[PDB]
C-alpha cells in the first residue's frame, strides 16, 4: 500500500524498475570488462580501474533510481539480471565500442523515460532525470567516445604499442 | 509598469499570486499544529519542532515565489490568508494526517503550476519549480508518510506509550 | 591462456565462479531487502541500511573472489544472476529469518570449498578463505542469530511496538 | 639440545633448511639479475631496481623461515649457494621469464613443504606459510606474468623502443 502516491502512473512505475534493471545489467557487464583485463594474459590495468568505477557509476544511478521509486510510492521489482554478452572482451578498442553501444543503449531508455513523463504530465521526473542520468550519460559517451578516439588513432600506427600508451598515459592511476 | 517582463503570462502570474497565499496557509496551518502539541496537557514537543519547522519551510517557499514574481516582472498581490482548517488537532497521527492532505493540496498545486507552463511555453518555471519545489514536496511527503506509518505502528501496539515514544525516538531535540 | 597458473584445478576455478555467482546473488537480494524496508509503508529505516551493508559486504566479497581467481591464472566466467526469492519480505523477523538462511547457504558453499582445497592439495586457498570469508561468516550470522532472539523477544511483547524499539535501538543510525 | 622441540618431525626441520637454501640462491639469482639491467651497455635502471628488491624480499624469506626454525628448537644446517644458472640475461621478457621459472620453483617447494605438514599432523605450518609465503608468491607470480605480458606486448611492437617504455613508464623510479 501507499499512503503517499500522487500523479505517479504505473506505466512510468513499469518503466523504472525496467531502467533499474538495465542500470544493474550495466554494471554487471562492467564488472564483467574490468576483471578481464586484470586476466595476467590481458593486464591492462587503468582498462581494469576505469570499467571497474563505471560498474560503481551504473549500481549507483540503479539505487537512485530505486530511491525515487520508493520517493514516489511506486514499489520496487526486480527481475533476473542476465549475463554480459561476451566472457572475453577482445583489444581495448573492442572494448571501448562495446561499452558506447551499452551507454547508447541506456541513453535510449533515459530518452524513452524522458518522452513518457512528459506524455504522462509527470514533471518530478525533468528533475530527476536531467542532471544525474541524462547530463551524466551525455558527459560520460563524450568521455567514452574521446577515449576510442585515442586508442584508434595509437592502434592504426601500432597495435601492442599503442594499447600499452593509451594504458599509461590517458587512464588513471 | 515593468521595463522587463518577458513571456511572462497573466494566467502564470495570477498562479503564482494563488500559490503564495497557499504556502502562506500551509505556514499558518503549521504555526496552529505546532502549537497544540506544545499545550501543557498534549506535551509533545519533538511535534512542536516538527511542525514548527515545516511553518518555517513554508513561509521560505511563499518567499520564494515572490522573489521569482518580481525578477519575471510580475506583480505580488496578497489576499486574506484564512484561518487553519482546526482549532484542535486531536492525536500525532490525526495531525500527520491532516499534515499530509496539505502536503498534497499543495502538490497539486504545484503541478497545476507546472502544467501551466508547459501549455504558456514558459521554460523559466522549468527550473524554477523542479527542485526548491517539485523535488522537495516530493521527499517531504515521503518524510510525513514514513511518520504516519511509524506512529500507526505504535499506536497499533498502545496509543500513549506509541505517541511518547516515536516523539522521543523518531522527532528531533 | 595463463603464463602463472600453478597447482589450481579446473574443478576450484569453476567452484569459485560459482561462489562468485552465489555472493553476487546475496548481494541482489540484500538490495532488495533494503528498499523493502525503506517503502513508505514499512518505514524502519535502520533495517534499511543494515540489509544495504550486507549487499555491499556481499558485493565485496565477490570481487575478492574475482581478484583471487585471476591472481591463480583462472578464468572469470559469469551467469545470470536469478532474481531474489521474494517481491516482500513480511515482518522484521522475517526478514532476519531469510537472511540466515541466505548466509548459511553461503557458508555451507564455503565450507564446500574450503574441504574441495583440501582435498585438491591446493593449500592458497586455506590463507585465501580463513579469515574474509569463513571468519566473517561467523561473525556475520552470530550477529544476526542475535538479531532474530532480540526481535523474537521483542514482537512476543508487542508486534508493533516491538519492531519500532528494535529498529531504532539496536540498529545503527 | 633442545628444551622446547614438540611436534616438530626431522623431515620438516630438513625440507625447512632445504627451503633456507632455496629462498638464499633466488636472493642471490635476483642480485645478477639487478646488477645486468646496470650494465652501461644494459642501463635499464627500473629493472635494476626491480630484481634488486626482490633479492631483498627473497633474502627476508630466508631469515623468516631460519627464526621459525628457531622458534621450534630445529637447527639451522647451511649448504653452498649455488651460483645462478647464467652471467648474462638477455633482454627483458628473457628476463621475466627466468625469474617466473624461479619463482614457480620457490612456490613448488612451499606447495610440498604445506603437504608435508599436513602429512606429519603439524599444524604450525599452516599459521607459518599461509601468509608471508604462499600468499606473497601468488601475489609476485601474478605481478610478474602482468609485467611478461606489458612487456611481450610492447616488444611484439618494436624491440628497443618497447623495452625502453616498459622500464620508464611501469617500473618504479
Redo the contacts between chains.
Keep these: 500500500?501507499?499512503?503517499?502516491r500522487?500523479?505517479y502512473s504505473t506505466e512510468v512505475e513499469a518503466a523504472v524498475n525496467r531502467l533499474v534493471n538495465l542500470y544493474?545489467r550495466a554494471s554487471?557487464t562492467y564488472?564483467?570488462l574490468g576483471?578481464?583485463f586484470?586476466?595476467?594474459?590481458?593486464?591492462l590495468?587503468g582498462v581494469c580501474h576505469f570499467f571497474r568505477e563505471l560498474a560503481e557509476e551504473k549500481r549507483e544511478g540503479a539505487?537512485r533510481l530505486?530511491?525515487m521509486?520508493?520517493?514516489?510510492?511506486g514499489?520496487?521489482?526486480?527481475?533476473?539480471?542476465?549475463?554480459?554478452s561476451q566472457?572475453e572482451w577482445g583489444t581495448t578498442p573492442d572494448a571501448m565500442k562495446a561499452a558506447i553501444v551499452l551507454e547508447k543503449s541506456l541513453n535510449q531508455a533515459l530518452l524513452d523515460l524522458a518522452a513518457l513523463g512528459s506524455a504522462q504530465?509527470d514533471?518530478?521526473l525533468?528533475?530527476?532525470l536531467?542532471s544525474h542520468f541524462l547530463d551524466e550519460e551525455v558527459k560520460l559517451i563524450k568521455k567514452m567516445g574521446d577515449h576510442l578516439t585515442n586508442i584508434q588513432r595509437l592502434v592504426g600506427s601500432?597495435?601492442?604499442?599503442?594499447?600499452?600508451?593509451f594504458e599509461?598515459?590517458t587512464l588513471k592511476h
Excluded at 75 to 84: G, I, S
Design positions: 500500500s501507499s499512503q503517499i500522487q500523479n544493474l554487471y564488472l564483467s576483471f578481464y586484470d586476466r595476467d594474459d590481458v593486464a590495468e539505487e530505486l530511491k521509486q520508493n520517493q514516489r510510492g514499489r520496487a521489482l526486480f527481475q533476473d539480471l542476465q549475463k554480459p566472457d504530465a514533471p518530478h525533468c528533475d530527476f536531467e601500432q597495435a601492442g604499442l599503442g594499447e600499452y600508451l599509461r598515459l
